[PDB]
Design a protein around this ligand. Structure first.
Ligand code: ARG
Ligand code: MG
Ligand code: MG
Ligand code: MG
Ligand code: MG
Ligand code: MG
Ligand code: MG
Ligand code: MG
Ligand code: MG
Ligand code: MG
Ligand code: MG
Ligand code: MG
Ligand code: MG
Ligand code: MG
Ligand code: MG
Ligand code: MG
Ligand code: MG
Ligand code: MG
Ligand code: MG
Ligand code: MG
Ligand code: MG
Ligand code: MG
Ligand code: MG
Ligand code: MG
Ligand code: MG
Ligand code: MG
Ligand code: MG
Ligand code: MG
Ligand code: MG
Ligand code: MG
Ligand code: MG
Ligand code: MG
Ligand code: MG
Ligand code: MG
Ligand code: MG
Ligand code: MG
Ligand code: MG
Ligand code: MG
Ligand code: MG
Ligand code: MG
Ligand code: MG
Ligand code: MG
Ligand code: MG
Ligand code: MG
Ligand code: MG
Ligand code: MG
Ligand code: MG
Ligand code: MG
Ligand code: MG
Ligand code: MG
Ligand code: MG
Ligand code: MG
Ligand code: MG
Ligand code: MG
Ligand code: MG
Ligand code: MG
Ligand code: MG
Ligand code: MG
Ligand code: MG
Ligand code: MG
Ligand code: MG
Ligand code: MG
Ligand code: MG
Ligand code: MG
Ligand code: MG
Ligand code: MG
Ligand code: MG
Ligand code: MG
Ligand code: MG
Ligand code: MG
Ligand code: MG
Ligand code: MG
Ligand code: MG
Ligand code: MG
Ligand code: MG
Ligand code: MG
Ligand code: MG
Ligand code: MG
Ligand code: MG
Ligand code: MG
Ligand code: MG
Ligand code: MG
Ligand code: MG
Ligand code: MG
Ligand code: MG
Ligand code: MG
Ligand code: MG
Ligand code: MG
Ligand code: MG
Ligand code: MG
Ligand code: MG
Ligand code: MG
Ligand code: MG
Ligand code: MG
Ligand code: MG
Ligand code: MG
Ligand code: MG
Ligand code: MG
Ligand code: MG
Ligand code: MG
Ligand code: MG
Ligand code: MG
Ligand code: MG
Ligand code: MG
Ligand code: MG
Ligand code: MG
Ligand code: MG
Ligand code: MG
Ligand code: MG
Ligand code: MG
Ligand code: MG
Ligand code: MG
Ligand code: MG
Ligand code: MG
Ligand code: MG
Ligand code: MG
Ligand code: MG
Ligand code: MG
Ligand code: MG
Ligand code: MG
Ligand code: MG
Ligand code: MG
Ligand code: MG
Ligand code: MG
Ligand code: MG
Ligand code: MG
Ligand code: MG
Ligand code: MG
Ligand code: MG
Ligand code: MG
Ligand code: MG
Ligand code: MG
Ligand code: MG
Ligand code: MG
Ligand code: MG
Ligand code: MG
Ligand code: MG
Ligand code: MG
Ligand code: MG
Ligand code: MG
Ligand code: MG
Ligand code: MG
Ligand code: MG
Ligand code: MG
Ligand code: MG
Ligand code: MG
Ligand code: MG
Ligand code: MG
Ligand code: MG
Ligand code: MG
Ligand code: MG
Ligand code: MG
Ligand code: MG
Ligand code: MG
Ligand code: MG
Ligand code: MG
Ligand code: MG
Ligand code: MG
Ligand code: MG
Ligand code: MG
Ligand code: MG
Ligand code: MG
Ligand code: MG
Ligand code: MG
Ligand code: MG
Ligand code: MG
Ligand code: MG
Ligand code: MG
Ligand code: MG
Ligand code: MG
Ligand code: MG
Ligand code: MG
Ligand code: MG
Ligand code: MG
Ligand code: MG
Ligand code: MG
Ligand code: MG
Ligand code: MG
Ligand code: MG
Ligand code: MG
Ligand code: MG
Ligand code: MG
Ligand code: MG
Ligand code: MG
Ligand code: MG
Ligand code: MG
Ligand code: MG
Ligand code: MG
Ligand code: MG
Ligand code: MG
Ligand code: MG
Ligand code: MG
Ligand code: MG
Ligand code: MG
Ligand code: MG
Ligand code: MG
Ligand code: MG
Ligand code: MG
Ligand code: MG
Ligand code: MG
Ligand code: MG
Ligand code: MG
Ligand code: MG
Ligand code: MG
Ligand code: MG
Ligand code: MG
Ligand code: MG
Ligand code: MG
Ligand code: MG
Ligand code: MG
Ligand code: MG
Ligand code: MG
Ligand code: MG
Ligand code: MG
Ligand code: MG
Ligand code: MG
Ligand code: MG
Ligand code: MG
Ligand code: MG
Ligand code: MG
Ligand code: MG
Ligand code: MG
Ligand code: MG
Ligand code: MG
Ligand code: MG
Ligand code: MG
Ligand code: MG
Ligand code: MG
Ligand code: MG
Ligand code: MG
Ligand code: MG
Ligand code: MG
Ligand code: MG
Ligand code: MG
Ligand code: MG
Ligand code: MG
Ligand code: MG
Lengths: 116, 202, 149, 64
RNA sequence: CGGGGGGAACCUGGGGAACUGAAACAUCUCAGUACCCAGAGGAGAGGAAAGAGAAAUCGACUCCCUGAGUAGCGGCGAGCG
RNA sequence: GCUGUUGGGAAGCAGCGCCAGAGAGGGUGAAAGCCCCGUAGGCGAAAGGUGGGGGGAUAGGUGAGGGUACCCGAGUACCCCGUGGUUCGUGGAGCCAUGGGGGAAUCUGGGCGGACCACCGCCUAAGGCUAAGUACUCCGGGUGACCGAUAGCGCACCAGUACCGUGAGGGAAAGGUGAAAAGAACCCCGGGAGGGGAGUGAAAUAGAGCCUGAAACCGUGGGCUUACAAGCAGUCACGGCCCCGAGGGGUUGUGGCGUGCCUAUUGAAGCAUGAGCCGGCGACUCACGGUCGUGGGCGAGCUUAAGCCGUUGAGGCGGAGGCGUAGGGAAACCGAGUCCGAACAGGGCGCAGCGGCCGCAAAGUCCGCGGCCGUGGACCCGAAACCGGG
RNA sequence: GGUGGAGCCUGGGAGUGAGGGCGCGAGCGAUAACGUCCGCGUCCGAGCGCGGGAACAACCGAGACCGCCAGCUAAGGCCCC
RNA sequence: GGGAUGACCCCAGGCGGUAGGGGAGCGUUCCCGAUGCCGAUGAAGGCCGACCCGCGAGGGCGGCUGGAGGUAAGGGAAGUG
RNA sequence: GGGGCCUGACUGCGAGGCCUGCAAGCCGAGCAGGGGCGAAAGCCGGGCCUAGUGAACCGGUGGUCCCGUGUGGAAGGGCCA
């Protein structure tokens, strides 16, 4: 019994083109070029979702060092105090106290200058 | 071994026979797939790259034409050309072991015997070659039509009466086979057809 | 039982190995066949049972023994198949080449020769040759050997 | 079509009862004058072939 | 009275290669296959033992199974059978 | 087999019935055992053809001892020389056939049984004929776990055609409206083509350039966005606008990161190969044999092959034979042993189920399935060349 | 001592038989070569996935099942990018 | 380890990867299942989907087109991506 | 290095091992047969050692007396060297 391609090939090419919607030129209109693109973005994502956690921390850190320096010290000198002080609040939160609740943070700064 | 319900004018007497106790699903399976294989036609065919009806001239030179390399346009890489490993006539039939069938021919029945779906009869009272002469019978035998049936007798007239019936499989007991048994929900026989049966699994 | 009920026992109808159908199968592209080489090529290698790459083969380098025959060919001389005593326990009474054939012990065309690896039975045995050991056991066990011509 | 018994083997070798390949010993066809008596003596006997090579020389004997 | 020519393959006779295989190649193989020619027919050939070959046996020929990839053949190589 | 019902159409769903030696299938406005063509089961030939079976003719057929020693297939048998066939490639080389030379006999003859001689046996050449069982498939029919318009024959259609070639020869593409043409009267813009209403239809982006109508490709309208930017074009975070009704979709301004796919490579984004794009064809199979594994059946036993009967998707018969039950040896030959050997020596290849009679397991064997191997085009396409006949 | 995708044995299926950089020991080379030929090892090959090295298969770090807007570290780094 | 057996639960450890070995599955054509079930209140196919289940290949659901075919659990065979 | 008598420069095997991809190549105690040198214990299966060589196929010579193509022989072979 014969069994030609039939309905199978097309459909799969419509899987790849639906995920390729929004791509420039053929990349969204040509199948082959849609795969070659979906390949990269496939690795770019997981290569980048692994990075989001590093793009922020560095940010967060960048904001804390700014505040810390408003009180007469630097990000380096108060990470230690919070260590020595036994404080485990994280840079994400620390980065939000530094902006919205600037007088809580000031405390932490103080509890850091002393823990040393 | 098993008590068989026999349907006589005197009344449902019972009979016993030493049908197998264990049912091997695999064996019953292998019989069928034999039955269902050796009855295949084997008439699928494709026309190889030499059987096609073109010439053989190298369509254009091997080099310097600027296009691919080709020979005869009967190559399966062409359209309308040869077919690679497509079918040909074949003898799907094959030689299943006898005991494997003489055994699956007793396992088959016995199964229906466990269910009580097996029924025997001395004769068929008043059938003489007219279907309607049968349902009146089958009615009185509890054969309402709600169950597919395998009628297994030598009496021609009988087999001729019910063979057109959407829920009855007819067979000379000389042709009783598993697949037809399993095909069905019940199973009926003459003590005759019952007798030869015995004399085939023996 | 019912057609839908009829499975084969697990493992008695294994799938197949389709090579050349994608990266996922682990069999795509080179079709489990390697990269280049006479072995990947179609048709492939000369009989690996013998050929060795040009050097004189292991088998051609071995010496030939004994008579290899000549034309017209095989010589016809009576042929003997030996059956052991223990294989004769099943019978009662009188054993002959025939019965031992229809039993499945002696092939046709061959003659009957009794062996002794077993224990005799006080049986009338008819054959074309016994062994020294077989006789002693056969005459000792109250048997009646009977040679043929 | 069915396989053909390779005669180049059936004339040199012989399959035992356990599945081994036994071929005569190579060396004493000619050039034997200065050979030992031990060397002529030992070479007049069969030797079990290496497992890999024997396995091959049995696939050539499909009917023995 | 008969013949002449045609017929898809199938059949018998007269002739008859090569690539290829032998991991080169000449004997060898491919193979008396492909092909050409004459002929015949619904079939053609073969066929009533100056046979087979060891049974003191068989009983024309044809075909299939089996005998058997046995006996044997072979730069005893590939392979043939 | 009518009705009722939804519907453009009933064969659909509902109610009540019927046939069935016919519930194979195909049609009918859709899905019909009972509407049409058919199916099971039966009928049928004035005339041509055939007539392998029946009956009838005819040519043709037939005894025994006794003596006789006329006949019993000629350039033949037979010998040598040169070849062909047979499994036989000069081999120890017979047998069958015959181109060259020499060249008999008629049963007390002659050929044969693998050079030759003898014994013993088989046959009776040099004239011819001979049914069926066997092979093929232009033709007709039945049937398919065969194809379904790049498939299936090269042709589903006006195909060995158009077209290519001086010629042999090469060799396509091309199917489908609808249940029914009821195939769009008439009017309007236009030379026409084409369209716009009217009208038909269940449906007219089913309008004949017609079933379904995908993708590349082209265009019109809309939302977001872009003229100080840089780039395998994407991914992550955020923000602005648009849509849908703590959320999601489309879009992209900025910041971060980022060297196509495949191929061949020690190593490619790679200035190494292949590919403009899309859609369809397109490459590890089959038969026999072998060898491991596996699910089963039987088990010192297992199994049949061609065939015969049965069936018309019914299976059963068939034991010839093959593998196994014993191996060792070049062999005679011995044999649980055997071979080298003087050996009672030494060595090679060999030799011996589990519980309580039973059951269970197994050597082995058989069919299935799977991987791999041998033989064939054997995973697909590709040479330059050889050969044969035209 | 060691219970590890350790080892022994029998059997089926392969691929590989074109390696390359680095480090140390040599030969050859000119105490040349991104040179060549061997030895122990390592890595790339197959980790062209990640961090460092401005950028770079093989130098330093480190063996990526998947997800997080959590924490600690290695090489390397902390004036600005 | 539970419990008894692939019922699901807990603890621990493994899971970069070319050639290549192995295992478990999806999907296409076809056959039994089928004189059956689905279908004009609309089959197969086609365009959308931001919803559902699946690691994924894929499977359902809904809306538009489409206008007569399709085919389940469980198995079989391939011109199967 | 000298000399005396000698032929073990044995036949039939050969446990166990070195080496090793195959096949080969290498060492070899000891048992019997029959001998040699020695008072004896003991040594001797050529050479202080490591190269001085060539697998199968085909055929020659001596021996064996295994097969002998209806049987007894022969042709021609196989085994030993
Ligand atoms: N009488 C019989 N043996 N009938 C067997 C079945 C015959 C046929 N196949 C049918 O179905 O009608
Ligand atoms: Mg395809
Ligand atoms: Mg498709
Ligand atoms: Mg595809
Ligand atoms: Mg798909
Ligand atoms: Mg993807
Ligand atoms: Mg990353
Ligand atoms: Mg991190
Ligand atoms: Mg940032
Ligand atoms: Mg400061
Ligand atoms: Mg901390
Ligand atoms: Mg604020
Ligand atoms: Mg087929
Ligand atoms: Mg052709
Ligand atoms: Mg052709
Ligand atoms: Mg043609
Ligand atoms: Mg051209
Ligand atoms: Mg060609
Ligand atoms: Mg063309
Ligand atoms: Mg062709
Ligand atoms: Mg074709
Ligand atoms: Mg065509
Ligand atoms: Mg074409
Ligand atoms: Mg094809
Ligand atoms: Mg092919
Ligand atoms: Mg056939
Ligand atoms: Mg098969
Ligand atoms: Mg068959
Ligand atoms: Mg049914
Ligand atoms: Mg019926
Ligand atoms: Mg299969
Ligand atoms: Mg297969
Ligand atoms: Mg792989
Ligand atoms: Mg695999
Ligand atoms: Mg390949
Ligand atoms: Mg492979
Ligand atoms: Mg392979
Ligand atoms: Mg390749
Ligand atoms: Mg290669
Ligand atoms: Mg290779
Ligand atoms: Mg090829
Ligand atoms: Mg080749
Ligand atoms: Mg022989
Ligand atoms: Mg033998
Ligand atoms: Mg030798
Ligand atoms: Mg010799
Ligand atoms: Mg020497
Ligand atoms: Mg010596
Ligand atoms: Mg000797
Ligand atoms: Mg045999
Ligand atoms: Mg045997
Ligand atoms: Mg004619
Ligand atoms: Mg001829
Ligand atoms: Mg010629
Ligand atoms: Mg040639
Ligand atoms: Mg060829
Ligand atoms: Mg070959
Ligand atoms: Mg060939
Ligand atoms: Mg050649
Ligand atoms: Mg070659
Ligand atoms: Mg050449
Ligand atoms: Mg030939
Ligand atoms: Mg001819
Ligand atoms: Mg003529
Ligand atoms: Mg003619
Ligand atoms: Mg005929
Ligand atoms: Mg004739
Ligand atoms: Mg005559
Ligand atoms: Mg045989
Ligand atoms: Mg055989
Ligand atoms: Mg040879
Ligand atoms: Mg030939
Ligand atoms: Mg109405
Ligand atoms: Mg009605
Ligand atoms: Mg019907
Ligand atoms: Mg019918
Ligand atoms: Mg119909
Ligand atoms: Mg239908
Ligand atoms: Mg109907
Ligand atoms: Mg009829
Ligand atoms: Mg009639
Ligand atoms: Mg007469
Ligand atoms: Mg007379
Ligand atoms: Mg006379
Ligand atoms: Mg010849
Ligand atoms: Mg000669
Ligand atoms: Mg000759
Ligand atoms: Mg002969
Ligand atoms: Mg002559
Ligand atoms: Mg005479
Ligand atoms: Mg005479
Ligand atoms: Mg003659
Ligand atoms: Mg003569
Ligand atoms: Mg003669
Ligand atoms: Mg004769
Ligand atoms: Mg003779
Ligand atoms: Mg005579
Ligand atoms: Mg004769
Ligand atoms: Mg005559
Ligand atoms: Mg004639
Ligand atoms: Mg005739
Ligand atoms: Mg005939
Ligand atoms: Mg026909
Ligand atoms: Mg169709
Ligand atoms: Mg189809
Ligand atoms: Mg078409
Ligand atoms: Mg066509
Ligand atoms: Mg179409
Ligand atoms: Mg021309
Ligand atoms: Mg013309
Ligand atoms: Mg041409
Ligand atoms: Mg036309
Ligand atoms: Mg129509
Ligand atoms: Mg007008
Ligand atoms: Mg006008
Ligand atoms: Mg006008
Ligand atoms: Mg008009
Ligand atoms: Mg109009
Ligand atoms: Mg209307
Ligand atoms: Mg409607
Ligand atoms: Mg509609
Ligand atoms: Mg439309
Ligand atoms: Mg329409
Ligand atoms: Mg239609
Ligand atoms: Mg259209
Ligand atoms: Mg259109
Ligand atoms: Mg626009
Ligand atoms: Mg500027
Ligand atoms: Mg701007
Ligand atoms: Mg951010
Ligand atoms: Mg809400
Ligand atoms: Mg940057
Ligand atoms: Mg960006
Ligand atoms: Mg990178
Ligand atoms: Mg790079
Ligand atoms: Mg390249
Ligand atoms: Mg290169
Ligand atoms: Mg680039
Ligand atoms: Mg470029
Ligand atoms: Mg290249
Ligand atoms: Mg490429
Ligand atoms: Mg182009
Ligand atoms: Mg495509
Ligand atoms: Mg393929
Ligand atoms: Mg394969
Ligand atoms: Mg095929
Ligand atoms: Mg096969
Ligand atoms: Mg196999
Ligand atoms: Mg069985
Ligand atoms: Mg049997
Ligand atoms: Mg021994
Ligand atoms: Mg032993
Ligand atoms: Mg058992
Ligand atoms: Mg098997
Ligand atoms: Mg293999
Ligand atoms: Mg072939
Ligand atoms: Mg192939
Ligand atoms: Mg091909
Ligand atoms: Mg080609
Ligand atoms: Mg070619
Ligand atoms: Mg030439
Ligand atoms: Mg030439
Ligand atoms: Mg373990
Ligand atoms: Mg490992
Ligand atoms: Mg390992
Ligand atoms: Mg292995
Ligand atoms: Mg090499
Ligand atoms: Mg290299
Ligand atoms: Mg290579
Ligand atoms: Mg190399
Ligand atoms: Mg190297
Ligand atoms: Mg290098
Ligand atoms: Mg570098
Ligand atoms: Mg280095
Ligand atoms: Mg250093
Ligand atoms: Mg150094
Ligand atoms: Mg160095
Ligand atoms: Mg050196
Ligand atoms: Mg250097
Ligand atoms: Mg180099
Ligand atoms: Mg090198
Ligand atoms: Mg590589
Ligand atoms: Mg690394
Ligand atoms: Mg590594
Ligand atoms: Mg790296
Ligand atoms: Mg990379
Ligand atoms: Mg890259
Ligand atoms: Mg890196
Ligand atoms: Mg970097
Ligand atoms: Mg950097
Ligand atoms: Mg590690
Ligand atoms: Mg820290
Ligand atoms: Mg820096
Ligand atoms: Mg900067
Ligand atoms: Mg992994
Ligand atoms: Mg890991
Ligand atoms: Mg690993
Ligand atoms: Mg691989
Ligand atoms: Mg596994
Ligand atoms: Mg698998
Ligand atoms: Mg499946
Ligand atoms: Mg598919
Ligand atoms: Mg049906
Ligand atoms: Mg249907
Ligand atoms: Mg309607
Ligand atoms: Mg609708
Ligand atoms: Mg379909
Ligand atoms: Mg479907
Ligand atoms: Mg739909
Ligand atoms: Mg229909
Ligand atoms: Mg189905
Ligand atoms: Mg299913
Ligand atoms: Mg089934
Ligand atoms: Mg195909
Ligand atoms: Mg294919
Ligand atoms: Mg001295
Ligand atoms: Mg001296
Ligand atoms: Mg003396
Ligand atoms: Mg040894
Ligand atoms: Mg060795
Ligand atoms: Mg030597
Ligand atoms: Mg002694
Ligand atoms: Mg002595
Ligand atoms: Mg003395
Ligand atoms: Mg010694
Ligand atoms: Mg020396
Ligand atoms: Mg000396
Ligand atoms: Mg040499
Ligand atoms: Mg040679
Ligand atoms: Mg002897
Ligand atoms: Mg004789
Ligand atoms: Mg003799
Ligand atoms: Mg005499
Ligand atoms: Mg004489
Ligand atoms: Mg002689
Ligand atoms: Mg001789
Ligand atoms: Mg010798």
């Amino acid at each position: 019994p014969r069994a030609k391609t039939g309905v199978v090939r097309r459909r799969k090419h419509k899987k790849i083109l639906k995920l390729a919607k929004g791509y420039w030129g053929l990349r969204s209109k040509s199948f082959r070029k849609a795969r070659e693109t979906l390949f990269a973005a496939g690795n770019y994502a997981y290569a980048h979702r692994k990075r989001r956690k590093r793009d922020f921390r560095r940010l967060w850190i960048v904001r804390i060092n700014a505040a810390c320096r408003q009180h007469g010290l630097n990000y380096s000198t108060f990470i230690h105090g919070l260590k020595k002080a036994g404080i485990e609040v994280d840079r994400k939160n620390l980065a939000d106290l530094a902006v919205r609740e600037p007088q809580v943070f000031a405390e932490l700064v103080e509890r850091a200058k002393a823990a040393q | 071994v098993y008590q068989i319900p026999v349907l006589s004018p005197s009344g449902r007497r019972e009979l016993a026979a030493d049908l197998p106790a264990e049912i091997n699903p695999h064996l019953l399976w292998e019989v069928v797939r034999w039955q269902l294989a050796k009855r295949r036609r084997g008439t699928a065919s494709t026309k190889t790259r030499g059987e096609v009806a073109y010439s053989g001239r190298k369509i254009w030179p091997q080099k310097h034409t600027g296009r691919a390399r080709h020979g005869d346009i009967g190559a399966p890489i062409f359209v309308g050309g040869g077919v690679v490993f497509g079918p040909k006539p074949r003898d799907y039939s094959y030689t299943l072991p006898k005991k494997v069938r003489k055994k699956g021919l007793a396992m088959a029945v016995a199964d229906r015997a466990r269910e009580g779906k097996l029924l025997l009869v001395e004769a068929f009272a008043g059938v003489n070659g007219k279907t309607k002469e049968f349902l009146a019978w089958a009615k009185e035998a509890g054969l309402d039509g709600s169950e597919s049936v395998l009628l297994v007798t030598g009496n021609e007239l009988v087999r001729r009466a019910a063979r057109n019936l959407p829920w009855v499989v007819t067979l000379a007991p000389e042709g009783l086979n598993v697949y037809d048994i399993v095909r069905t929900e019940r199973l009926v026989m003459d003590l005759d057809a019952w007798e030869v049966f015995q004399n085939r699994i023996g | 039982m019912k057609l839908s009920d009829l499975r084969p026992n697990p493992g008695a109808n294994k799938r197949r190995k389709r090579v050349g159908r994608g990266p996922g199968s682990g069999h795509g592209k080179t079709a489990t066949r390697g990269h280049k080489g006479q072995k990947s090529r179609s048709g492939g290698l000369k009989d690996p049972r013998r050929f060795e790459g040009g050097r004189s083969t292991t088998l051609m380098r071995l010496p030939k023994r004994g008579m290899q025959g000549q034309v017209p060919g095989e010589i016809k001389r009576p042929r003997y198949q030996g059956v052991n005593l223990k294989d004769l326990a099943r019978f009662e009474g009188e054993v002959t080449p025939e019965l031992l054939v229809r039993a499945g012990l002696l092939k046709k065309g061959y003659r009957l020769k009794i062996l002794g690896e077993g224990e005799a039975k006080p049986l009338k045995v008819v054959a074309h040759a016994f062994s020294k050991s077989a006789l002693e056991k056969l005459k000792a066990a109250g048997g009646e050997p009977v040679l043929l011509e | 079509p069915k396989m053909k018994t390779h005669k180049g083997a059936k004339k040199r070798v012989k399959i035992t009862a356990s599945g081994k390949v036994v071929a005569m010993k190579t060396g004493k066809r000619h050039l034997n004058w200065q050979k030992s008596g031990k060397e002529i003596r030992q070479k007049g006997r069969k030797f079990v072939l290496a497992k890999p090579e024997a396995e091959r020389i049995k696939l050539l004997l499909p009917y023995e």
